[PDB]
């Protein structure tokens, strides 16, 4: 959570950091506001499980339970209301870099940053987050297939390995990650309690 900036320094580094923070805030606000024989097939809906998962997430306090159950390990198994078992995964880190280093010093009168690599690191992280939020913005909330930004290679491999299926299916699907990525889906989900969560839908080959 970021609220406002008060320091009015002259050095260019402060100006760059303030501009990047403003871009971050604008992206967060935008994402907040975003909240032959062919006629014998059927019009059955494509994305339905993700809608149910998001609706369960929108219920009272489930996101708080998920956040409180993922404080020590980045990967765990959490159970929602009613009955369901869904994998949860945490990516990136913004609860330590921006809340412990930049916020306590910007909210002052005479801020000054005597370094240059922090700008590069902050711009890289903000570029990643802004790319994610822009790709959600352009496609009106539904994207297909999932780009490299939402799911990296290592994370996808870990998710496939942790998927509760047999061994032959894992062997067949881990060698053709392009195809399984092509047929997946992504749904942008509830925003609240300073935590952003969305749903990724991966196919489960059966035959």
């Amino acid at each position, epitope marked *: 959570n970021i609220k406002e900036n008060k*320091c*009015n*320094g*002259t050095d260019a580094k402060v100006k760059l950091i303030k501009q990047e923070l403003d871009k971050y805030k604008n992206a967060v606000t935008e994402l907040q506001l975003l909240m032959f024989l062919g006629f014998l097939l059927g019009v059955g809906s494509a994305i339905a499980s993700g809608v149910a998962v998001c609706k369960v997430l929108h219920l009272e306090g489930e996101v708080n339970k998920i956040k409180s159950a993922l404080l020590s390990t980045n990967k765990a198994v959490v159970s929602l209301s009613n009955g369901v078992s869904v994998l949860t995964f945490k990516v990136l880190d913004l609860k330590n870099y921006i809340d*412990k*280093q*930049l916020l*306590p*010093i*910007l*909210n*002052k*009168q*005479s*801020c*000054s*940053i*005597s*370094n240059i690599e*922090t700008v590069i690191e902050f711009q890289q992280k903000n570029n990643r987050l802004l790319e994610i939020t822009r790709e959600f913005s352009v496609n009106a909330g539904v994207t297909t297939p999932v780009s490299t930004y939402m799911l990296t290679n290592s994370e996808l491999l870990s998710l496939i390995n942790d998927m509760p299926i047999t061994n032959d299916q894992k062997k067949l699907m881990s060698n053709n990650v392009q195809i399984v990525r092509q047929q997946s889906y992504s749904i942008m989900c509830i925003i609240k309690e300073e935590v952003l969560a969305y749903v990724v839908q991966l196919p489960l080959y059966g035959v």
Partner: antibody, heavy 124, light 112 residues
Framework: QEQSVQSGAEVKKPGASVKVSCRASEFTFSSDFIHWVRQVPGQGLEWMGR????????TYAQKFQGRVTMTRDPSTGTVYIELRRLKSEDTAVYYCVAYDRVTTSAGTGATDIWGQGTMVTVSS | DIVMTQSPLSLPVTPGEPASISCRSS???????????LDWYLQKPGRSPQLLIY???HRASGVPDRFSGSGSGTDFTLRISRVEAEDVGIYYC?????????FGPGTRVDLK
């Protein structure tokens, strides 16, 4: 950066007690310390003491130990300082200042605001 | 406590030439994690003191781009890039490491 926030001038007599009040709600900036600085005309500055507005922890100097008392009134967030037995030589000017500084891995923040200052004199 | 000295105790200045004032300290003022804890204060005749330099070699709001600080350890220098006719007054040297805070005697700067 004078903010023009203090009490008025004070004229007293030896053997009595003097009271100086500074209100810390018009500094326009949040502060973590309210250090008091005294200055006798014709000389330099000299530290007097400090109190934390959050709780009221007091820290004085060795020379002024056992004579000055600082208190905080949370009705308007004001600080009061009491001096006892002004055995002359205390004719000076008192300032209440906001003084905070924080350091991190990359970047330092500071906030320093001085006050208008009051004049306290003792005479027969 | 900690005892401070300044040099010189009198320094007339010309409107267009630079100037430098040195603060010399007792046992090192250098903190741990980083950065010094010394400050340079300015005072015009009659008004209230205004901060000039904080934490060694940084600048606060205002203070147009002709004041600078330098030094590491026990000696520090305040340098004026190009003085003007509005810098007459008294300069003070302050510490922030322990809390027997002790201002310096004060250097007087007047127009020549």
């Amino acid at each position: 950066q004078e903010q023009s926030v203090q009490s008025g001038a004070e004229v007293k007599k030896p053997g009595a007690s003097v009271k100086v009040s500074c209100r810390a709600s018009e500094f326009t900036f949040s502060s973590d310390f309210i250090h008091w600085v005294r200055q006798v005309p014709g000389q330099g500055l000299e530290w007097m003491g400090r109190i934390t507005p959050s709780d009221g922890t007091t820290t004085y100097a060795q020379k002024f130990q056992g004579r000055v008392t600082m208190t905080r009134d949370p009705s308007t967030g004001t600080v009061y300082i009491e001096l006892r037995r002004l055995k002359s030589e205390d004719t000076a000017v008192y300032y209440c200042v906001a003084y905070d500084r924080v350091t991190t891995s990359a970047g330092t923040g500071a906030t320093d605001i001085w006050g208008q200052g009051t004049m306290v004199t003792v005479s027969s | 406590d900690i005892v401070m000295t300044q040099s010189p105790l009198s320094l007339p200045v010309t409107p267009g030439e630079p100037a430098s004032i040195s603060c010399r300290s007792s046992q090192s003022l250098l903190h741990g994690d980083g950065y010094n804890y010394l400050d340079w204060y300015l005072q015009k005749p009659g008004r209230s003191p205004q901060l000039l330099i904080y934490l060694g070699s940084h600048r606060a709001s205002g203070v147009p781009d002709r004041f600078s600080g330098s030094g590491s350890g026990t000696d520090f220098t305040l340098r004026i890039s190009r003085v003007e006719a509005e810098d007459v007054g008294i300069y003070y040297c302050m510490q922030g490491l322990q809390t027997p805070f002790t201002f310096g005697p004060g250097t007087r700067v007047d127009l020549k």
